[PDB]
Structure 1
Amino acid sequence: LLRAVIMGAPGSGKGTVSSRITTHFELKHLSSGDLLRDNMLRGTEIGVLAKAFIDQGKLIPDDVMTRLALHELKNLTQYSWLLDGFPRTLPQAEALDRAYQIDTVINLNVPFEVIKQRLTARWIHPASGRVYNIEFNPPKTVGIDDLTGEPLIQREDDKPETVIKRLKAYEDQTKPVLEYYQKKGVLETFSGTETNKIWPYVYAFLQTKVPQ
């Protein structure tokens, strides 16, 4: 049975790649964010704790997150796994190593400038809610709405300052995790600037590793 982790920065295409892996291979997709959000929805104590941290822009503490992830995994050992979002930090990776033999770690290596561009592409016309993406459907005139000529704005989560801070936090957290897995010889890296250029190689890689 496959014991796999997938890693990638926000905007790297991890959601898409993970969804495609789950569609094509006989395994369970175990997303930490989905596990947290399901607990939040069900109003469990770990859910209320999760919200308390998430709402303040904080990571779930390592000890709490690891206890929750391992508890989920305990009752999933009959299946192949793709862990997605855990481990997020070196202490989480080390704790996971003490619990299960992890055979494969996939990292999506998309250049910083490409991810930053993807994450800052969205502009909105506030009154109508019309969305423009300067990569995919830019406005006919820079900075203004096609129908009104009124200015476009960027939501706080899409501004370059916010995005740069998010990416730097991600890099600080995961650089040590990637080093850990690389030293262990289980890190497989897929580099590219478009998800559809990367996906075929991930798909081919997994052929010998887990049933279709």
Structure 2
Amino acid sequence: KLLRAVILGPPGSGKGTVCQRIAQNFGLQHLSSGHFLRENIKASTEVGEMAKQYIEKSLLVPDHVITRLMMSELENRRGQHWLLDGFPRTLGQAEALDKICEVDLVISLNIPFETLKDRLSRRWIHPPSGRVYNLDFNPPHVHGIDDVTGEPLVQQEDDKPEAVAARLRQYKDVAKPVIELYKSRGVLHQFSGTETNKIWPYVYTLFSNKITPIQSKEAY
């Protein structure tokens, strides 16, 4: 009935980029744990307050806290098509997911470390606004500064080479049971390469099997 789709891959792999193309071609919003984590911190909710207790201590917010805030969001979006970016991260989150839907489509992105490192080295942000500047696509009008405020741009910690390598290894270690699970159900589609542009046509085709591509009024 409603679509239940998932895009997985290590940080830097282009999950956000693919989700954005899916929005422009299908009108399908994507849902991510980081985005819902932000939203809960801004609203100062009970789960937001739990996450902040970890963050204040420079601790990773545990998977179970993320499962909690994600299931709560999905359980309140039961009449919507879902496109999940990077969730489930773990086998236990995949199983949590199983209780409230049947996952139709899983896209896995396998991108070499060198590409990950080179993509993320080219990303800068304006931290207060969260405006993101990809230097190969949308660089700031003036070098080093935000387009509105002219305040200096920052490189996110996770975007630096050592952090990129650490996060890739963290991903590899956790990803295998999740990919195996969806592989045995026949819903997993795996893509490798260095260019999102080259992977996109295959992903497009998979979504158009499930939901109608948007066309313009005068395309008839």
Judged with a 3 Å threshold, the aligned counterparts in structure 2 of structure 1 residues 4 and 46 are, in CA distance, closer, same or farther, namely: same
Q: What is the deviation of 1:175?
A: 2.0
Identity of matched residues, %: 57
Distance 2:172 2:166 in 1: 10
* Equivalent position of 1:65 in the other structure: 66
Distance 1:201 1:156 in 2: 32
State the secondary structure of the residue aligned to 1:108.
strand
* Equivalent position of 1:170 in the other structure: 171
* Equivalent position of 2:43 in the other structure: 42
Judged with a 3 Å threshold, the aligned counterparts in structure 2 of structure 1 residues 155 and 73 are, in CA distance, closer, same or farther, namely: closer
Q: What is the deviation of 1:99?
A: 2.4
Number of corresponding residues: 186
Structure with the greater alpha carbon radius of gyration:
1
After superposition, what is the alpha-carbon deviation per residue over 1:160-201, rounded to whole angstroms, capped at 9, x for unaligned? 322211211122122221111112211111222111111122
TM-score by length of 2: 0.74
Structure 1, gaps ≥5 residues long: 124-130, 137-153
Letter in 2 for 1:88: R
* Equivalent position of 2:79 in the other structure: 78
Aligned positions of 1:1-212 closer than 5 A: 1-54=2-55, 56-62=58-64, 64-120=65-121, 157-212=158-213
Q: What is the deviation of 1:88?
A: 1.0
Judged with a 3 Å threshold, the aligned counterparts in structure 2 of structure 1 residues 192 and 54 are, in CA distance, closer, same or farther, namely: farther
Distance 1:197 1:91 in 2: 32
State the secondary structure of the residue aligned to 2:6.
strand
Q: What is the deviation of 1:25?
A: 1.3
Judged with a 3 Å threshold, the aligned counterparts in structure 2 of structure 1 residues 208 and 61 are, in CA distance, closer, same or farther, namely: closer
Q: What is the deviation of 1:28?
A: 3.4
1:26, 1:211 within 8 Å by CA — same for their partners in 2? no
Distance 1:40 1:88 in 2: 21
Structure 2, gaps ≥5 residues long: 125-132, 138-154, 214-220
After superposition, what is the alpha-carbon deviation per residue over 1:36-55, rounded to whole angstroms, capped at 9, x for unaligned? 10111111121122233345
1:26, 1:80 within 8 Å by CA — same for their partners in 2? no
Judged with a 3 Å threshold, the aligned counterparts in structure 2 of structure 1 residues 60 and 23 are, in CA distance, closer, same or farther, namely: farther
Judged with a 3 Å threshold, the aligned counterparts in structure 2 of structure 1 residues 24 and 58 are, in CA distance, closer, same or farther, namely: same
Distance 1:156 1:27 in 2: 30
State the secondary structure of the residue aligned to 2:190.
strand
Letter in 2 for 1:73: L
Q: What is the deviation of 1:118?
A: 2.6
1:7, 1:14 within 8 Å by CA — same for their partners in 2? yes
CA RMSD of aligned residues (A): 2.6
